[PDB]
């Protein structure tokens, strides 16, 4: 929200923890959901 990103895919950010031993992390996060409008268009068989 602070940098104006919401409802998008692959939001990357990179931060450093403030402390006497300081470490740097890297994180990417998304909300992936996949759909079909018509669930009955594809026929899936198993052959043998």
């Amino acid at each position: 929200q602070r940098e104006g990103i919401n409802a998008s895919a692959r939001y990357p950010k990179n931060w450093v923890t403030t402390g006497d031993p300081a470490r740097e992390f890297t994180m990417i996060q998304s909300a992936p959901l996949m759909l079909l409008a018509d669930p009955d268009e594809f026929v899936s068989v198993q052959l043998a």
Partner: protein
Amino acid sequence: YHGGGSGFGGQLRSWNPPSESVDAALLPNFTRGNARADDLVRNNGYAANAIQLHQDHIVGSFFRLSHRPSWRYLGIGEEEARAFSREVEAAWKEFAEDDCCCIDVERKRTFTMMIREGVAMHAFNGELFVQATWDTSSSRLFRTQFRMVSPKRISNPNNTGDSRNCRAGVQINDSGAALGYYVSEDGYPGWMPQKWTWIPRELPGGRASFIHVFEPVEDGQTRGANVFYSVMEQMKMLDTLQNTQLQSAIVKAMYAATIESELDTQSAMDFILGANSQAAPVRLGGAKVPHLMPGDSLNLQTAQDTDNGYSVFEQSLLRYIAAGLGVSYEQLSRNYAQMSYSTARASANESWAYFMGRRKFVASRQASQMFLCWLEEAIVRRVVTLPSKARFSFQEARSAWGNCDWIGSGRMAIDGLKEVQEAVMLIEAGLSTYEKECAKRGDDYQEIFAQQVRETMERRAAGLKPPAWAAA
């Protein structure tokens, strides 16, 4: 920097707008915004007045052509260029001013009407589309025709979503330029499903087939946004306030009295109001003095001032709306307070700058593209002839051969004599020329010169004093 922070006392802790280009902020809600703006243009007086101002001041009552080819680059010569310009101007003037309205396929407009509609449809929708086709079966001199397409029609086929290479019914290549457009079918009845076609922008020879005119704001913008997005909310709320205040005024002024008694409804009105039992209607003749027993009473109800400070609030809102649209406040609201000459002239010039900008971009670009599309035919069908010994063929440089300047209607000054006096003062000195002055009245100096050379002869032959401009 306090702008990018929390704010004064944390009041802006929730003001966190998304950071996204014009596309991500416009495309999902295009149709709704267009429909609301069309509602406001159709069902609000002020917005329709603003649209009429746009149409009348941008274009006017005539949109004249002035052909000025760049003859120096082409290496053709001045006299041949003048003859070519005269011929092509005459051909255009006869073609586009047909009384039977055969420039457009629908046979409902003329050239000036079409330019005005283009400006208006730019105003309340953000873009204008013109399609150039042929009617092969027609036997006229020119087979070129133009059809005006409303922006609502351009949509993705089958109402699917936006893919990377097809945004809002407009094909986009690897770069931002367009390649072709998807056009629906005119469906007036709800039923009879719609058929979606495909129209390439340019024919393979380079001739224009589909025209799209709109001013971008950012880098990549498939379709523009109309002028109303700044003041969509305020005009609707202003309309609601006006209607509500009017209804409230009528209700408050309706109840002119109140009867207090303890008798029947009929007898109380008989004895106090004066109605007759043969609720009960009362005739308004005369002045009446009732007689009341101790139990009864009569109150003449009083209402507030009908217009308590509503006019000034309407003034503030109309000033805001006018500032949003671009038309001056006195042109929008018809207010015209007591003002000196200087204030009126300042306001007129401030609106005029914007009007001239819009005319120079929108109408001029559309008319230039249409004129080029017509000039290809004239040249190809040999209605007119190209100057000989030309460095470039017509196709290699369309702009150089078809370069054109358009003249609209001139402004109507606040003071009649001062404009004429300044025009004469400029012409007497070298600061200007006859062409620029005659253009500010929407006239062509060559036509004026021809008219004057005819008038001097007509006066001389008939026995009258020769005119002022006549040479001894």
